Amino acid sequence: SPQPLEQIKLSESQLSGRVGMIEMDLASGRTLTAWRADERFPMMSTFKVVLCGAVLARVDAGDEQLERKIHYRQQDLVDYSPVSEKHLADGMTVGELCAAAITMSDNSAANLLLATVGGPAGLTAFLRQIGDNVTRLDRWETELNEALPGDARDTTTPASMAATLRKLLTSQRLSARSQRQLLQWMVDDRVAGPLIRSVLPAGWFIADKTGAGERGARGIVALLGPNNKAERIVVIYLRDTPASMAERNQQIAGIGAALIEHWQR
Numbered sequence: 001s002p003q004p005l006e007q008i009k010l011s012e013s014q015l016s017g018r019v020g021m022i023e024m025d026l027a028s029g030r031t032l033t034a035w036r037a038d039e040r041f042p043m044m045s046t047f048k049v050v051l052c053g054a055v056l057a058r059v060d061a062g063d064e065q066l067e068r069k070i071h072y073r074q075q076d077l078v079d080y081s082p083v084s085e086k087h088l089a090d091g092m093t094v095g096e097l098c099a100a101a102i103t104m105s106d107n108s109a110a111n112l113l114l115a116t117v118g119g120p121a122g123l124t125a126f127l128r129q130i131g132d133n134v135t136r137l138d139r140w141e142t143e144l145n146e147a148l149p150g151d152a153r154d155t156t157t158p159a160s161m162a163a164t165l166r167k168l169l170t171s172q173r174l175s176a177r178s179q180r181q182l183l184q185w186m187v188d189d190r191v192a193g194p195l196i197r198s199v200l201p202a203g204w205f206i207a208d209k210t211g212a213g214e215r216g217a218r219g220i221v222a223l224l225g226p227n228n229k230a231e232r233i234v235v236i237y238l239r240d241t242p243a244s245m246a247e248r249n250q251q252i253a254g255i256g257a258a259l260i261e262h263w264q265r
């Protein structure tokens, strides 16, 4: 593989779109490498991890329980809700909703959870409260995927998303059990996790959340490292490319391959 930045440049040239990337140590926040890390990209479903961080903060505060069962209606559903559409009769617990949102990218589960944290504005307030002054959620699923050029709605930057994920996972802002729960949901991703894991070299830890939207928008937030350790956060976003989904997946994979082969100490 080429060096990471060289691969990224190739990807931008081939996609005619922007790539945003950061690789950051989970424990300390040391930035290893970065590209357009301060530029805005649509979060798409990667926001679902931050959402469930906010849910866990409410649990820690005694304002929520992962056990609490929410009964909802067919009228509440939006598209791409493979788990929540199966539970109109019996409902889902708050914990099950977060598992569905993170591991199956379930959109209605995410919207139900979003309401519990005060909607997009409430989630944005939570972000400000943990010192993220950049990331913003403005809309619900699925409109938040629109990815209009010039539109700051529903965007983050690679640097802010990585810093925020680090804060949620390790900064002791969340309780120990909450930190462990958030990581486990990412470990359990079913959308891309198993596929990624199958093509990673032996020994590499993976946990992730992916996203996809309009105008080529595609992304992944991941924990990755050799020796079966969640050593680093890797964030890769793509935007404003007319490329096929297959090519977008392959370009992210190629960037990943370069990062893995040229992993610095």
Ligand SMILES: OC[C@H]1O[C@H](O[C@H]2[C@H](O)[C@@H](O)[C@H](OCCCCCCC3CCCCC3)O[C@@H]2CO)[C@H](O)[C@@H](O)[C@@H]1O
Pocket: 001, 196, 199, 200, 201, 202, 208, 220, 222, 224, 234, 235, 236, 252, 253, 254, 256, 257, 258, 260, 261
């Ligand atoms: O010499 C280093 C390694 O080179 C190859 O590994 C390849 C692998 O065969 C390929 O399948 C993967 O694709 C990378 C696909 C990863 C999935 C996307 C990455 C995501 C998730 C993680 C962070 C964000 C991006 O690259 C590595 C590095 O070349 C060899 O197969 C392996 O034996 C060797 O240990």
Ligand SMILES: *[B]([O])([O])[C][N]C(=O)[C]([N]C(=O)N1[C]=[C]N([C][C])C(=O)C1=O)C1=[C][C]=C([O])[C]=[C]1
Pocket: 043, 044, 045, 046, 079, 080, 105, 107, 141, 142, 143, 145, 146, 210, 211, 212, 213, 214
């Ligand atoms: B997550 O990445 O936020 C889940 N992604 C989606 O649900 C994607 N959906 C859309 O991008 N999408 C855009 C606009 N609206 C019009 C109101 C939609 O209908 C809509 O669902 C998504 C992306 C790629 C896919 O193959 C499926 C869904």
